[PDB]
Amino acid sequence: MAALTRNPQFQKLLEWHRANSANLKLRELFEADPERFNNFSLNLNTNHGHILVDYSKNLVSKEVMQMLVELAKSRGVEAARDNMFSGSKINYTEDRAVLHVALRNRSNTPIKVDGKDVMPEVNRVLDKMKSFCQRVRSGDWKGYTGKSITDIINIGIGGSDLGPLMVTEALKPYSKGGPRVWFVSNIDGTHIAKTLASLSPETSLFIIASKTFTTQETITNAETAKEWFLEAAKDPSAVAKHFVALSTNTAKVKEFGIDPQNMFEFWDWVGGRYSLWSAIGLSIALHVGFDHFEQLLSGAHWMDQHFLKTPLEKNAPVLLALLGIWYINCYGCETHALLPYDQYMHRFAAYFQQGDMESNGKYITKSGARVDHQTGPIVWGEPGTNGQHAFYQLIHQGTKMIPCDFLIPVQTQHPIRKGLHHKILLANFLAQTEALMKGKLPEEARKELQAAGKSPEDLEKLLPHKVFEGNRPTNSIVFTKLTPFILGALIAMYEHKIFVQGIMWDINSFDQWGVELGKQLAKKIEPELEGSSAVTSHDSSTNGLISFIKQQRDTKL
Amino acid sequence: MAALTRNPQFQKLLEWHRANSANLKLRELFEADPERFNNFSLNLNTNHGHILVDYSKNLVSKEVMQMLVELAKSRGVEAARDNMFSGSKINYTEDRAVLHVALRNRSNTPIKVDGKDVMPEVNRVLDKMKSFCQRVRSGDWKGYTGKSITDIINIGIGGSDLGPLMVTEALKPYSKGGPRVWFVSNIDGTHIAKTLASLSPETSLFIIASKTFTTQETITNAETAKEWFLEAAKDPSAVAKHFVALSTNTAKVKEFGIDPQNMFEFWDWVGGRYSLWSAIGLSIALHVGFDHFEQLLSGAHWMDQHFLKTPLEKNAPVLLALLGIWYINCYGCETHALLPYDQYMHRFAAYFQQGDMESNGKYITKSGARVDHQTGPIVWGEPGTNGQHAFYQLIHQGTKMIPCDFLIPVQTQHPIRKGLHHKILLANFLAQTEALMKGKLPEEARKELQAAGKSPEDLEKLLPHKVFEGNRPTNSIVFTKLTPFILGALIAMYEHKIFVQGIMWDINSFDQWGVELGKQLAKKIEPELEGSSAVTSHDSSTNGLISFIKQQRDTKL
């Protein structure tokens, strides 16, 4: 077996679930205990707003929470946490520290890797970013014809894209005075082509985000942008006015035509999917200003400290992690839905798809043994209220158990019509989790059918269709306002949830060996596509698809 | 028990699965049988391009496919289909026909509901759409100050939003010469606020899309739009130049105050999530032109005829549906990922979240029996290569089985850099499904680490992390080009897949009773948010969240 399944607190939890989970009914839990919301929620005061983490609509009793906390302890969560924060090389397959918490370490307390405090270099790069932001935002940085920059284009993939994109979308109201921001990530030529079509070479600045500066898709996109730019500028020396790098590869950066003074460094202890807090966040700082970027870091820092200092039983990311374990490893739920009731947060779920699924979509434990239990869930979702009219039908009346996190700011950035829209949004947010829990009893549905004038025959036929079984668990995460600080705290909360789950599963949340095979095979196929000759070097499906491609690419439609 | 589980062919399939499925190994299936691609793929010639549905990388043999086809026949798929197409009232809980196929019935063969041909009215509304599109696109239609329309704003949610949004995004290259299109859907005030901030009341035309014309989100948004408009125009007669309606509810439309000549009608047998083919597609037609809209309809019509006339064993939507059943009901896979390798198709998976999940997220059968088996899956995904660099780690090395459909056009709309970007995109599309199928054996990974110069200790430490178990099934769907015609055929293909699965589960794919309870509960909460008084009328969580909202809404941040 594996570490988790060999653990006796886990065996006890599993045994308790088998014997008792059928007895757990949300309706009954709330009816028996009017202190339930009080005892199963955390109202966090950050001094820059409150975050209420309401986990009371979960299929848990006091005893279940006690068992889960005991399990987190006996799986080494407290020790693993301290190891991360101290700079121990907890990314064990790559022998690397994991120090995204250093990037936002506002206290400046020394954090050592290999005996050397990392904070001077973190703060050096931050200072460089702040200086660059001043130059671009003020209009002092001029393009090749002497004009101020109006547009910033981040070119990057995965971690170099999703973070900056989600945060700039989420924090759009804080971007007054800032340049427009664009994100190019897909190798699909459509992405760069449609971005470039709406831009001027004179006033656009490109941020090429790649640690190694050899990332195929990113560098291809970058070179395409350079080609486009040089067609207009006709001067290789002008590239340095319009292209900067988030990288450590001085030589490749120089070769591209970028001034190495405009290379913004980060370190191997910064994972791609934990990188928005580093130089990778340069586009965020340009868009909303460095002051707001620091507020984002400070919120994350607040949450880092909460995670570090708080006893497990009242520790927000730990509790969220434990609930997930309960549903994944005891109930066997394959997915987790993230449902922010906020249009600005429309890319939040997509971001945590990488954050969660690339971290914890793993099957080998620290010992090298295969897991014999589930690990990370499939993460998905869309913002409310749109989801209600898309897929909540399945959540309410399907055959799947789907843990959902509902998120919403109390205060809206756009209180139009005296707050009418936000009142409706809030009411739907509250109503949906209430409905998921309560359902609708046959006696309730029967009376509704009778009042609608349904015949006894039609009533009988329709009745079961109108019943909602309920007992569907949710978390409600409510916060004062979606500010840079509060957004930073929320992202950090989920990063730490992911960390806790990985430790409990005995997996490495911080590597990504599963990307290798697809990369290797793609490199083999690339040269085979060119020309008319038949490709026979793969399985018949791959061969057959390539044949179709070669046959269909010259057809005029 | 339910119809499916009582079915003898289903119990036979399940028993075969129990006894034999562990012996299905894709790598070995392909080595043993050079004809595998040929026997497990459909190359469809539409005369307007080809669609290759390659299902060879599935965990199936000839025997499995034979049993699945036999099950489909046993479940009455052909009769159910014919009933749909002839206008039988197969939406049995609402006593309605289901005739999205009539909307695109290019042949104009009569289809009767209650003994009356529906086609004259379908075609009457199509002619009205054609005329309106010509007037707006030509610049002949003038706003209240006498200026041509530059922007179209679709206000609608769910079925009234996702279809037109996904199609206009997918068909963006075909929109040259058309007005800019905007979609407002969320009740969240952000959505309409940031849309209106970018518009002029003089040159904006709003399209209020609502089957019922009573949906709170849509009518609220519409009323906000009208107030904004009237603040500028100061003339109620001007509304008729700037607002049109897409609805089935004439009375409610006139009640809102729209010119009855500005109402584009559809019918109760048009489901919201099947409605882009109706008047609901007006924003599509305005954006890309009525000719391209007709091509979209014609593509769907082609696929309707394929579905209607083709033997089950060669019938694309039926085969896709059957593979789905195999994974859902035999393997127990909760999800289905849709992965189009096309940035224009970035909303394709979202569309089918509604389409699939709202249709088949059901638990009561035609007989009134509660299902005792799984129904519709959770549908999710992102376009390649975006999704690739986000979450494929979990698909390759997680603990979940995830059937994936990979989709790509052979011909790109933007063949930049002499096709370099599309070559890379295609190679990744191909490599990923090859990788998922083949994996990488311990001995293969050992040889790679051997060659990298890893020491015995370093090799042994890393080895298990580098192993890919493979045997992960995929569909590859490749088509000549994403034209309006081909897109129409692809959407209809999945609509019919959803239909077939529903018939097989004995559920009603065409109702959505699961939305009612959330709506009722939201109406109750709305007025309780007003004022500073404590709410005690709900469970303690709802009460507590409301207390939080009231406490937090006045805090300055």
User: CA A237, A241, A246 angle in degrees (round to 5)?
Assistant: 110
Asked if B168 and A391 touch (Cβ cutoff 8 Å), the reply is no
Of B189, B396, B511, the CB nearest to A421: B189
Q: Phi first, then psi: what are they for B295, rounded to 5°?
A: -60, -45
Q: Is A452 on the interface with B (CB under 8 A)?
A: no
Residue A183 is which amino acid? F
For chain A positions 211-230, those within 8 Å of chain B (CB to CB) are 216-217, 220, 224, 227
Stated as kind and residue range, the H or E segment containing B474 is strand B474-481
Which residue in chain A has the smallest CA separation from B345? A190
Is residue B223 among the annotated active site residues?
no
**How far does A146 lie from chain B, in Å, by closest CA?**
28
Q: B318: Cβ–Cβ under 8 A, 6 or more apart, which residues?
A: B69, B72, B77, B307, B312, B496, B497, B500
Which residue in chain B has the smallest CA separation from A382? B350
CB contact (8 A) between residue B526 and residue A427 = yes
Q: Which residue from A64, A62, A84, A31 is spatially nearest to A499, judged by alpha carbons?
A: A84
Q: How far apart are CA B166 and CA B6, in angstroms?
A: 39
**CA dihedral over A477, A480, A483, A485, signed as positive or negative:** negative
B389, B400, B461, B524: which is the annotated catalytic residue? B389
For chain B positions 1-60, those within 8 Å of chain A (CB to CB) are 27, 30-31, 33-38, 41, 43, 48-50, 52, 54, 56-57
User: CA A338, A342, A344 angle in degrees (round to 5)?
Assistant: 105
CB contact (8 A) between residue A52 and residue B360 = no
Half-sphere exposure of A132 (CA within 13 A, CB side): 28
Q: How far apart are CA A445 and CA A467, in angstroms?
A: 6
Asked if A184 and A153 touch (Cβ cutoff 8 Å), the reply is yes
Pairs across A and B, CB distance < 8 A = 515
Residue A69 is which amino acid? V
**CA dihedral over B502, B503, B506, B509, signed as positive or negative:** positive
Q: Would you call A340 helix, strand, or coil by DSSP?
A: strand
Query: Is the preceding omega at residue B385 within 30 degrees of 0, hence cis?
Result: yes
Q: Phi first, then psi: what are they for A483, rounded to 5°?
A: -95, 170
Stated as kind and residue range, the H or E segment containing A407 is strand A404-411
**Which tokens in the block code for residue A546?**
């390539």
B73, B423, B461, B519: which is the annotated catalytic residue? B519
Contacts B154 to A, Cβ<8 Å: none
Is residue B389 among the annotated active site residues?
yes
Q: Which residue from A390, A169, A192, A403 is spatially nearest to A288, judged by alpha carbons?
A: A169
**How far does A81 lie from chain B, in Å, by closest CA?**
23
Q: Which residue from A420, A275, A432, A413 is spatially nearest to A344, judged by alpha carbons?
A: A413
Residue B65 is which amino acid? M
CB contact (8 A) between residue A37 and residue B468 = no
Which residue in chain A has the smallest CA separation from B171? A190
Contacts B41 to A, Cβ<8 Å: 541, 544
Alpha helices in A310-441 (DSSP H): 316-325, 348-352, 359-360, 392-397, 416-438
Q: Using N-to-C axis directions, what is the helix angle for B290-309 and B316-325, rounded to 10°?
A: 70
What fold is seen in the domain B516-556? Answer: Phosphoglucose isomerase, C-terminal domain (1.10.1390)
**CA dihedral over A397, A402, A403, A408, signed as positive or negative:** negative
- Superfamily per CATH, domain B1-99+295-515: Glucose-6-phosphate isomerase like protein; domain 1 (3.40.50.10490)
Asked if A388 and B514 touch (Cβ cutoff 8 Å), the reply is no
**How far does B391 lie from chain A, in Å, by closest CA?**
5
Q: How far apart are CA A134 and CA A120, in angstroms?
A: 21
Q: Establish whether A213 is an annotated binding residue.
A: yes
Q: How far apart are CA B39 and CA B56, in angstroms?
A: 8
Q: Which residue from A194, A193, A203, A250 is spatially nearest to A227, judged by alpha carbons?
A: A193
Which residues of A are catalytically annotated?
358, 389, 519
Q: Would you call B232 helix, strand, or coil by DSSP?
A: helix
Q: Establish whether A519 is an annotated binding residue.
A: yes
Which residue in chain A has the smallest CA separation from B329? A399
The residue ranges of DSSP E strands in B323-436, in sequence order, are 335-340, 378-380, 404-411
**How far does A179 lie from chain B, in Å, by closest CA?**
16
Alpha helices in B115-239 (DSSP H): 119-137, 162-170, 189-196, 216-233
Contacts A538 to B, Cβ<8 Å: 434
Residue B486 is which amino acid? I
Q: Establish whether A389 is an annotated binding residue.
A: yes
Q: Establish whether A214 is an annotated binding residue.
A: yes
Q: For chain A, how big is the Rg over CA atoms in Å?
A: 26
**How far does B117 lie from chain A, in Å, by closest CA?**
28
CB contact (8 A) between residue A393 and residue B357 = yes
Of B33, B187, B227, the CB nearest to A425: B187
Q: How far apart are CA B128 and CA A345, in angstroms?
A: 38
Query: Is the preceding omega at residue A212 within 30 degrees of 0, hence cis?
Result: no
**Which tokens in the block code for residue B307?**
């579905």
Of A411, A521, A553, the CB nearest to B410: A553
Of A34, A400, A415, the CB nearest to B189: A415
Q: Which residue from B141, B174, B160 is spatially nearest to B218, judged by alpha carbons?
A: B160
Which residue in chain B has the smallest CA separation from A183? B386
Convert B171-188 to b/e letters by CB count within 10 Å (16 or more is b).
Answer: bbbbbeebbebbbbbbbb
What fold is seen in the domain B100-294? Answer: Rossmann fold (3.40.50)
Contacts A188 to B, Cβ<8 Å: 341-343, 383-385, 412, 421-422, 425
Asked if B385 and A157 touch (Cβ cutoff 8 Å), the reply is yes
Q: How far apart are CA A358 and CA A162, in angstroms?
A: 13
Asked if A411 and B555 touch (Cβ cutoff 8 Å), the reply is yes
Task: Give the distance from CA B369 to its chain's centroid.
Answer: 28
**Alpha carbon distances (Å) from A355 to A59, A81, A275, B216:** 26, 18, 11, 35
CB contact (8 A) between residue B394 and residue A370 = no
Q: Is B251 exposed, middle or buried (0-12, 13-18, 19+ CB in 10 A)?
A: exposed
Q: B105: Cβ–Cβ under 8 A, 6 or more apart, which residues?
A: B111, B119, B122, B301, B304
Parts of chain B belonging to CATH 3.40.50.10490: 1-99+295-515, 100-294
Contacts B93 to A, Cβ<8 Å: 461-462, 465
In terms of residues, how long is chain B? 557
Which residue in chain A has the smallest CA separation from B470? A517
**How far does B380 lie from chain A, in Å, by closest CA?**
7
Q: Which residue from B223, B225, B262 is spatially nearest to B240, judged by alpha carbons?
A: B262
What kind of experiment solved this structure? Answer: X-ray
Parts of chain A belonging to CATH 1.10.1390.10: 516-556
Q: Is B489 exposed, middle or buried (0-12, 13-18, 19+ CB in 10 A)?
A: buried
Q: How far apart are CA A398 and CA A377, in angstroms?
A: 19
**Which tokens in the block code for residue A146?**
């002497």
Which neighbouring-strand residues pair with B337?
A: B380, B404
